[PDB]
Amino acid sequence: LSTASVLAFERKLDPSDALMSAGAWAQRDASQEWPAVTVREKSQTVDVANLPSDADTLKVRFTLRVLGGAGTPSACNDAAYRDKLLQTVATYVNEQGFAELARRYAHNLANARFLWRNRVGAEAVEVRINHIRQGEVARTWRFDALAIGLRDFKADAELDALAELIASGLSGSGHVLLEVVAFARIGDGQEVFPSQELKTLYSVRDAAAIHSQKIGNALRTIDTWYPDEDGLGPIAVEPYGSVTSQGKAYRQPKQKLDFYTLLDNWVLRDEAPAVEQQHYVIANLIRGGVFGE
Amino acid sequence: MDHYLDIRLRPDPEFPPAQLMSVLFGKLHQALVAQGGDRIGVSFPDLDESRSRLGERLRIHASADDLRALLARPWLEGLRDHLQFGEPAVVPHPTPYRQVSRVQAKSNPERLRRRLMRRHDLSEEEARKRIPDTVARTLDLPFVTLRSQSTGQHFRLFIRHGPLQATAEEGGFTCYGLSKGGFVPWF
Fold first, then answer.
1. Domain-embedded: residue B52
2. Are the beta carbons of B90 and B29 closer than 8 angstroms?
3. How many domains does chain B have?
């Protein structure tokens, strides 16, 4: 029994492109006719997007789909390796649910980490999360994103209910569609930071916006078990867990803590790792990607 | 100035150190505008003049009450998860002193074209033969990126730490913390 030559997993927790609009604070519950943040050009010629001078609140909006079936690959050569991986994920699910992973995901939804440079320097940020069952709303969560820090994984009853919903979606017991709105208080006429294209800025039609993969990168920033340090905090889950800014890679394959050697020891040789490393492996499976030769 | 506070950039995968120090210097500038005054100094004790790096540290020099008031102000809101704090303590003895100066360049010929053409009513060819393209000065100084709030502009502010002296003399500081005659103790 060896690993398959092709092996591919579709991503779970699909986000949409987060759209930007502007408004004034305490109109946040009436933020349905809020005008979008227009990108303009100025003098080299640079495209910059700012808030209007009578607005201090940036509203970003996206939707997130939680689907389930995180063990089944979308393509696989070997059927024996596929059955071994499926029963490995089955014993992982029967040992513990998705509660730790959905807890960290609801933490990353609670704090506005998807606002990358729009959250820093903000005097107040607030996150409204709607569970939308039919075409109308079914549940509302209200979170102070400045209260939930970016370093520690806290505990809260509303956060635990949201995490139980996300874990129900990850286990295939129901279909989850969430709407995430975030309000950030920056000031009048300050600049916002949408994603930049290959200086040009990302735009859905006449509106500044963030890429969906940016929101997905912020959402999976849950990896707190890399063996170098833990005082820095969580990083995104990656095989050879690395970051583009520092130019350095944790989970180096000389150490036996990258995703690939963990998966090969767990599935092939039945060397089940630590439960935190099991969380890391299943988080990389929920992230998806192309694994194999 | 007797009292110093060391704040250290918490290392971040999410944000680069230069960016972190740029937004820290920007909020320091807005805090110094909000307080005013000219007795508020800055230093960077992690200098590396080989690669012109600013390091990771920010040492603010003032009195005890200025630093203790500047701790409890909203210029540190939204940032305190990203940096580690120190204590306002006294400078040890003995230490040398040096300055913190902004050194710009006339690295843009076009601005001197605009100045010499707006003050004299020259032509473009007269300003082009008057000042050539070789007037651009190259710099090996560290700098932190800053933005503008009202009318938006992006520029790099070069900081130069002056020569080490044995004694310090009187003098003011801007709202950037840079030296206008007053020196900071270097340690």
1. yes
2. no
3. 1
Q: Give the DSSP H or E segment for B25.
A: helix B17-35
Which residues, at least 6 apart from A75, have a Cβ–Cβ distance to it below 8 Å?
Answer: A6, A7, A8
Cα dihedral A189/A195/A198/A200 (nearest 10): -20
- The tokens of B166 are what? 């044995």
Indicate the residue of A121, A151, A187 with minimum beta-carbon distance to B23.
Answer: A121
Q: How far is CA A118 from CA A24, A44, A126, B163, in A?
A: 16, 24, 13, 39
Distance CA A245, CA A214 (A): 14
Residue whose pair of structure tokens reads 């809260």 in the numeric block: A156
Q: Looking at A207-264, which runs of residues are DSSP E strands?
A: 207-210, 242-243, 248-249
Q: Which of A119, A189, A246 sits opposite B13 (nearest CB)?
A: A246
Place of tokens 């920056």: A186
Domain extents in chain A:
1-10+70-97+222-293, 11-69+98-221
Is B120 catalytic? The answer is: no
Amino acid at A199: K
Beta bridge partners of A204: A207
Taking the CA atoms of B42, B45, B50 and B53 in sequence, report the sign of the dihedral they define: negative
State whether A120 and B77 contact (CB < 8 Å): no
Domain limits at B50?
3-104+137-185
The residues, ordered by sequence, that sit 6+ positions from A187 with a Cβ below 8 Å of its Cβ are: A51, A56, B149
DSSP B65-81: HHHHHHHTSTTSTTTTT
C-alpha closest to that of A147 among B7, B23, B81, B12: B81
Q: Can you say whether the dihedral through the CA atoms of A262, A263, A268, A272 is positive or negative? A: positive
Q: B150 — contact with chain A (CB < 8 Å)?
A: yes
Sequence-distant (6+) residues with CB within 8 A of A180 are: A61, A62, A63, A64, A109, A114, A127, A128, A129
Whichever domain contains B67, its CATH number is 3.30.70.2540
Determination approach: cryo-EM
Contact criterion met (CB < 8 Å) for B81 and A48: no
Under 8 Å between Cβ of B50 and B10: no
Name the token pair of B74.
């909203």
**Bridge partners, residue B97, by sequence:** B165, B185
A256 Cα distance to chain centroid: 26
